[PDB]
Ligand binder design. Sequence first.
Ligand SMILES: O=C(O)CN(CCN(CC(=O)O)CC(=O)O)CC(=O)O
Ligand SMILES: O=C(O)CN(CCN(CC(=O)O)CC(=O)O)CC(=O)O
Ligand SMILES: O=C(O)CN(CCN(CC(=O)O)CC(=O)O)CC(=O)O
Ligand SMILES: O=C(O)CN(CCN(CC(=O)O)CC(=O)O)CC(=O)O
Ligand SMILES: O=C(O)CN(CCN(CC(=O)O)CC(=O)O)CC(=O)O
Ligand SMILES: O=C(O)CN(CCN(CC(=O)O)CC(=O)O)CC(=O)O
Lengths: 77, 77, 77, 77, 77, 77, 77, 77, 77, 77, 77, 77
Amino acid sequence: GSVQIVYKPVDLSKVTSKCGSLGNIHHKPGGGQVEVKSEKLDFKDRVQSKIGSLDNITHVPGGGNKKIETHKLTFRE
Amino acid sequence: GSVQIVYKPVDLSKVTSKCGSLGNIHHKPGGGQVEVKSEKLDFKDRVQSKIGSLDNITHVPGGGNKKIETHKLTFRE
Amino acid sequence: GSVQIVYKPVDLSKVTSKCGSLGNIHHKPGGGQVEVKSEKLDFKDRVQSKIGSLDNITHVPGGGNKKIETHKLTFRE
Amino acid sequence: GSVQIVYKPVDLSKVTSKCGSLGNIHHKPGGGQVEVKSEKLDFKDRVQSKIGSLDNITHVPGGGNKKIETHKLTFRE
Amino acid sequence: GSVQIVYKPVDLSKVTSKCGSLGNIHHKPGGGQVEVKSEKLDFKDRVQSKIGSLDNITHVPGGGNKKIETHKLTFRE
Amino acid sequence: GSVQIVYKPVDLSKVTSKCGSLGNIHHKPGGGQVEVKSEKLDFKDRVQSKIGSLDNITHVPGGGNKKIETHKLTFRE
Amino acid sequence: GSVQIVYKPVDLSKVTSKCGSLGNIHHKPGGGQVEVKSEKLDFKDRVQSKIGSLDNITHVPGGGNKKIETHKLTFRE
Amino acid sequence: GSVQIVYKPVDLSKVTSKCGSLGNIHHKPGGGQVEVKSEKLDFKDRVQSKIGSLDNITHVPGGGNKKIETHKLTFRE
Amino acid sequence: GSVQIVYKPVDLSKVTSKCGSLGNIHHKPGGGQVEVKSEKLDFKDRVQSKIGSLDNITHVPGGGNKKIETHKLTFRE
Amino acid sequence: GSVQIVYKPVDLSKVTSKCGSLGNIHHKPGGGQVEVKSEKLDFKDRVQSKIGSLDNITHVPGGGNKKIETHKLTFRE
Amino acid sequence: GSVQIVYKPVDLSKVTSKCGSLGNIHHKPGGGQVEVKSEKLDFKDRVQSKIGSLDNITHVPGGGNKKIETHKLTFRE
Amino acid sequence: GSVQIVYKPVDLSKVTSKCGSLGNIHHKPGGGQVEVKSEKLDFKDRVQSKIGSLDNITHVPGGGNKKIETHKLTFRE
Ligand SMILES: O=C(O)CN(CCN(CC(=O)O)CC(=O)O)CC(=O)O
Ligand SMILES: O=C(O)CN(CCN(CC(=O)O)CC(=O)O)CC(=O)O
Ligand SMILES: O=C(O)CN(CCN(CC(=O)O)CC(=O)O)CC(=O)O
Ligand SMILES: O=C(O)CN(CCN(CC(=O)O)CC(=O)O)CC(=O)O
Ligand SMILES: O=C(O)CN(CCN(CC(=O)O)CC(=O)O)CC(=O)O
Ligand SMILES: O=C(O)CN(CCN(CC(=O)O)CC(=O)O)CC(=O)O
């Protein structure tokens, strides 16, 4: 008993964007106070914690387009 | 008993956007106070915690289009 | 019993972006106060912690387009 | 029982971006105060900690396009 | 029982970016105060810690495009 | 039982960038104060620590494009 | 015609206060935003204006007793 | 016509205060944002203006008692 | 016509205060942002202006008692 | 017509304060941002202006008692 | 017409203060950013201006008592 | 017409202060950034200006008591 598997999807997709003029952006975070109290921290795995943070992010990409594609083929017996 | 599987979807999709003029944006966060109290933290797996945070994010992408595509083929016996 | 597996997806996708003029961006974080108290920290795995941070990030890429593609083929008996 | 596996995906994708004029960017972080208290730290694995930080990052790449591609083929018996 | 595995993906991808004029960037971090107290630190593995830091980074690459590609073939018996 | 493995991926990818004029960049870090107190430090592995640092980095590469490629073939019995 | 005026009030008053233990007071103002727009301001006299203010005052005097006494004698012809 | 005026008030008043223990006071102002716009300011007299202020005052006097006494005698013809 | 004026008030007042223990006071102002715009300022008299200020004052006097006394005698013809 | 004026007030007042132990005071101003814009400033008199200031004052006098006394005698014809 | 004026007030006042132990004071100003823009400044009188200042003052006098006394006698015809 | 004026106030006042132990004082100003722009400055009188200053003052006098006394006698015809 033979098995024949042919896997070939075809992607011609396009992600584009056109913006004429981009600017004049003002980010003015006016302070703040953060206090966090903990005592015992145990992490044992893929762990992405974040504790006690006061962050400001200005993100202005001219583009910013994002394409994510995953191809998974599993042959098991 | 032979089995024949042919897998080839075809994608010609497009994601686009046009914007003439983009700007004149004002983000003014006026402070704030955050207090969090905990004592024992145990994380053991894929864990994405976040505790005690005062964050401001200004995100102004000229584009920002997003395409996500996943192809999964599972052959099991 | 022979098995034949042919794996060849074809990608002609494009991610593009055009922006005429990009600028005039003002990021003015106005201070802040962060206090975090912990006593015992044990991490034993892939762990990406971050504790007690006051960070400001200005990210202005002219492009910023991102393409992520993963091909995984698993043949098991 | 012979097994034949042919693996050859074809990538002609392109990531591009065109920006005419990029500049006039002002990053003015206005101070801040961070205090963090801990006593016992044990890390035994791939661990990427970061504790008690006041950082400012200005990132202005003319390009900034990013392409990530992984090909994994596993043949097990 | 013979096994034949042929592995040859083909990459013609391109990552490009054009920027006419890039400049006029002002980074003015206005001070700050960081205090961190810890007593016992044990790291025994691939560990990338960072403790008690006040850093400012101005990163302005004319290009900045990044391509990451990994090919892993595992044949096990 | 003979096994034949042929491994030859083909890379014609290009990473490029063109920038006309790049300059007029001002980095003015305005001081700061950092104090860190620890008593016992034991590191026994590949360890990349960094403690108590006030650093300023101005990085302005005309190019800055980065390509990373890894080919790993493992034949085990 | 003679006039005789004798002015001598006598004050033996006392203002006192006894407090055993005074403390454990927490003032935590959680931010706020104030905007005031005016164009023409003319003040010509004893004037005690105050415009556009975000103030926090913690006043904890151990005593705080206040005595105000005014003696005015006017002889006119 | 003779006039005789005798002016001698007598003050034996006392202002006192006792406080045993005074302390454990926490003032934590959590930021804030103030913007005030004016164009023309004319002050011509005893004038005590104050415009556009974000102030925090912690006042903890052990005593704090205040006595104000004014004696005014006016003889006019 | 003779006039006789005798002016001699007598002050034996006392202002006192006793405080046993005074301390353990925490003032932590958490940042803030102040912007004030004006164009024309004319002051011509005793004028005590103050414009655009972000001030923090910690005032902890062990005493702090205040006595103000004014004696004014006016003889006019 | 003779005039006799005798001016001799008598002051035996006392201002005192006792404090046993004074200390353990923490002043931690956490940054801040102040911007003030003006164009024309004319002051012609006793004028005590102050513009665009970010000041922190820690005032801890062991005593701090204040006595102000003014004696004014005006004889006019 | 003779005039007799006798001016001799008598001051036996005392200002005192006793403090046992004074200390353990921490002043930690955490940075800040001040920008002030003006163009034309004309001062012609007793003028005490101050523009664009970021100052920190720690004032801890063991005493600090202050006595101000003014005697003014004006005889006019 | 003779005039007799006798001026002799008597001052036996005392200003004193005792402090047992004074010390353990920490002043740690954490940086800061000040920019001031002006173009035309004309001062013609007793003028005490101060422009564009980042100063830190630690003032710890063991005494610090201050007495100010002014005697002004004006005889005019
Ligand atoms: O096919 C469409 O619907 C629109 N076309 C043309 C879009 N534009 C062309 C351009 O922007 O250069 C025509 C237009 O905007 O009128 C896109 C394509 O063929 O991929
Ligand atoms: O095919 C398309 O949809 C657009 N073309 C042409 C895009 N441009 C050409 C250029 O920018 O040099 C045409 C245009 O912008 O009108 C891209 C391609 O063939 O790869
Ligand atoms: O093929 C494309 O899509 C664009 N070409 C041409 C791009 N340029 C040529 C140049 O910059 O010298 C044409 C253009 O910018 O109009 C690149 C290539 O063939 O590798
Ligand atoms: O007269 C009164 O009413 C109270 N006395 C005495 C108050 N105290 C004396 C002290 O505190 O030393 C007595 C008490 O508190 O029982 C005050 C005075 O005579 O001036
Ligand atoms: O007269 C009073 O009311 C209190 N006395 C005495 C206050 N004390 C004396 C001291 O502190 O040395 C007595 C006490 O506190 O019990 C003050 C004075 O006569 O000037
Ligand atoms: O008269 C008073 O009220 C207190 N005395 C005495 C104060 N002290 C004396 C000293 O400190 O040496 C007495 C005391 O503290 O008990 C001061 C004076 O006569 O000038």
